[PDB]
Amino acid sequence: ESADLRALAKHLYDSYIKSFPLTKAKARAILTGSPFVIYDMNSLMMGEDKIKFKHEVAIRIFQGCQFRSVEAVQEITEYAKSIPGFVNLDLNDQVTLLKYGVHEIIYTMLASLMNKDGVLISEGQGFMTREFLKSLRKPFGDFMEPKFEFAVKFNALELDDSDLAIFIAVIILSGDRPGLLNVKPIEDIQDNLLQALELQLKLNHPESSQLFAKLLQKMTDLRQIVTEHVQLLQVIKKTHPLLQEIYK
Amino acid sequence: ESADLRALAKHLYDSYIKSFPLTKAKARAILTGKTTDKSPFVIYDMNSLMMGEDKIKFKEVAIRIFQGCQFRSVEAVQEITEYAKSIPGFVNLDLNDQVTLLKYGVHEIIYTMLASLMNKDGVLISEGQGFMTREFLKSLRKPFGDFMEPKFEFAVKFNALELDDSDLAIFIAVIILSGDRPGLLNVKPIEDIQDNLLQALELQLKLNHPESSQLFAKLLQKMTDLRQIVTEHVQLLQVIKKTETDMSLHPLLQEIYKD
Ligand SMILES: COc1ccc(C(=O)n2c(C)c(Cc3cccc(O[C@@H](C)C(=O)O)c3)c3cc(OC(F)(F)F)ccc32)cc1
Numbered sequence: 001e002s003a004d005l006r007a008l009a010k011h012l013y014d015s016y017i018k019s020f021p022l023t024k025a026k027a028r029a030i031l032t033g034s035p036f037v038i039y040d041m042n043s044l045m046m047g048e049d050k051i052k053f054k055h056e057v058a059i060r061i062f063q064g065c066q067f068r069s070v071e072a073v074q075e076i077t078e079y080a081k082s083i084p085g086f087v088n089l090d091l092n093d094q095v096t097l098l099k100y101g102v103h104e105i106i107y108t109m110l111a112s113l114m115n116k117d118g119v120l121i122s123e124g125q126g127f128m129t130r131e132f133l134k135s136l137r138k139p140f141g142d143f144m145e146p147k148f149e150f151a152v153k154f155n156a157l158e159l160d161d162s163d164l165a166i167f168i169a170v171i172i173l174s175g176d177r178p179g180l181l182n183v184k185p186i187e188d189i190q191d192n193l194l195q196a197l198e199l200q201l202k203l204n205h206p207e208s209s210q211l212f213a214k215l216l217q218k219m220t221d222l223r224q225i226v227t228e229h230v231q232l233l234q235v236i237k238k239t240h241p242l243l244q245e246i247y248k
Numbered sequence: 249e250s251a252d253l254r255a256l257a258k259h260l261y262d263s264y265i266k267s268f269p270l271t272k273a274k275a276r277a278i279l280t281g282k283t284t285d286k287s288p289f290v291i292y293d294m295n296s297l298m299m300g301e302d303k304i305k306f307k308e309v310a311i312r313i314f315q316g317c318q319f320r321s322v323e324a325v326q327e328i329t330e331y332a333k334s335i336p337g338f339v340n341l342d343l344n345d346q347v348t349l350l351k352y353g354v355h356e357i358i359y360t361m362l363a364s365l366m367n368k369d370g371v372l373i374s375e376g377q378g379f380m381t382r383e384f385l386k387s388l389r390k391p392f393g394d395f396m397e398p399k400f401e402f403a404v405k406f407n408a409l410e411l412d413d414s415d416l417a418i419f420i421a422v423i424i425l426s427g428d429r430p431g432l433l434n435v436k437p438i439e440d441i442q443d444n445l446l447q448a449l450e451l452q453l454k455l456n457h458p459e460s461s462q463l464f465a466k467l468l469q470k471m472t473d474l475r476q477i478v479t480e481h482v483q484l485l486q487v488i489k490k491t492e493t494d495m496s497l498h499p500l501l502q503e504i505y506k507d
């Protein structure tokens with residue numbers, strides 16, 4: 001019934017607002033008419049004075065990137081549990097859906113903070129030019145570049161938060177994660193989410209044909225770059241004890 | 249609102265179940281004979297000890313008891329570290345403090361979780377499939393004949409409170425979020441979180457144990473016992489480092505063992 005799908009869509013959007021402090025609406029405002037910009041080395045070390053952070057440079061930026069991801073994982077976990085029927089699944093399965101899902105969702109939402117020329121950082125207090133990041137030493141200079149390419153493609157679909165809120169729910173409820181014990185309910189929820197997302201895209205983007213389909217195709221792009229992302233970390237194993245424990 | 253607190257109690261229980269595979273519930277079942285779980289091999293002498301390698305999954309004996317148990321400590325730290333990240337606000341804190349809160353919280357959380365595996369006669373070992381008796385341990389060599397006994401005495405006193413895993417989960421969190429740790433940069437946001445956790449604990453206790461007069465207060469005092477356990481532990485550890493310089497401490501434990 002289209003009435004309840006519209007309710008599901010509003011429920012998730014409200015939960016997403018609570019779970020994610022820096023919305024896409026907010027990020028896009030900041031990128032388009034003031035956050036300190038980081039375009040080279042001098043601007044960076046200036047930027048710890050302006051925007052306060054935690055305790056060489058290529059590695060320091062990589063690491064602080066992990067910090068944020070751990071922060072992100074908690075936001076996604078908290079959002080995940082507001083998905084109807086999620087907490088009711090077998091606890092191991094919830095843990096399995098998150099394990100394989102948080103990456104795909106992080107890159108999805110990193111797209112909201114990026115454009116052609118760089119990426120907002122630190123709750124949007126900052127902006128890191130895309131040029132400075134590729135200026136970084138091999139292989140560091142090559143880490144965020146593949147994401148920039150995915151983001152600009154992805155942002156071309158002109159999704160808003162209310163779209164993204166359902167979309168990422170769909171990501172979490174993937175019935176093909178290894179090690180799932182009871183896939184019936186997982187796929188039951190996903191189809192519901194898929195319905196809500198199909199209607200949402202229609203009402204919210206009437207003039208955009210088959211956007212639903214085009215969006216589902218991007219989940220190919222996501223899983224590809226997630227694979228390629230883990231293998232890029234697994235050439236930086238070619239490189240505290242509690243810190244490595246907090247970030248494993 | 250009470251409703252915000254129950255929600256926090258549930259979230260914490262939920263992560264606790266996800267991060268610690270041997271709950272107190274599983275452990276009380278093994279320790280009584282419940283047919284939800286199968287029965288442990290008991291070790292009480294060197295002979296029983298020695299078929300236990302054939303029986304249950306796993307250099308003289310008292311040393312590699314201490315070594316086996318040592319690597320078990322490491323795994324626990326990882327789980328507590330895993331648990332800590334689920335604590336609303338913990339990973340947003342300053343990174344130097346996160347390390348700080350772990351550095352001091354972790355042993356107070358071990359002996360709390362280790363109590364779950366103990367009775368007045370011994371301790372489950374090897375994920376539950378073993379049971380090493382108190383006496384056997386107390387009878388080990390001159391230095392290694394005093395490791396476990398104080399944790400036994402705490403565990404006996406502590407298990408008196410009759411907490412379950414859903415209580416422990418909040419209380420384990422209150423331990424981590426201790427602003428009074430040495431070297432904390434921003435004590436203040438730490439204490440807004442603990443202030444909240446303690447509110448959650450209070451409610452959870454009053455509801456889960458509606459007859460246990462002052463369980464909350466009584467439970468906060470048990471943090472006193474915990475801190476004394478850690479100090480006797482650490483100093484007795486430096487004996488071993490000097491008795492047996494052939495013996496190595498795992499680095500993650502060695503870093504926690506600072507100050
Ligand atoms: C809910 O999902 C997200 C929440 C936060 C963020 C976020 O702020 N990030 C930003 C701005 C970034 C980009 C970035 C670049 C340089 C330093 C960064 O760390 C600090 C400055 C920070 O952003 O707080 C962050 C980011 C990277 C991340 O790891 C990666 F995706 F690469 F696997 C994860 C989250 C990241 C992204 C997704």
Ligand SMILES: COc1ccc(C(=O)n2c(C)c(Cc3cccc(O[C@@H](C)C(=O)O)c3)c3cc(OC(F)(F)F)ccc32)cc1
Pocket residue numbers: 306313316317318320321324327357358359360361362365371372373374375378380399
């Ligand atoms: C809350 O997290 C945990 C706390 C304790 C344990 C745990 O299993 N332990 C057990 C059963 C023990 C008890 C024990 C005694 C002898 C050998 C042991 O190790 C092997 C043989 C095993 O566990 O199978 C384990 C234990 C001891 C520890 O070191 C100490 F803190 F005491 F210095 C640490 C953890 C220990 C696991 C998780």
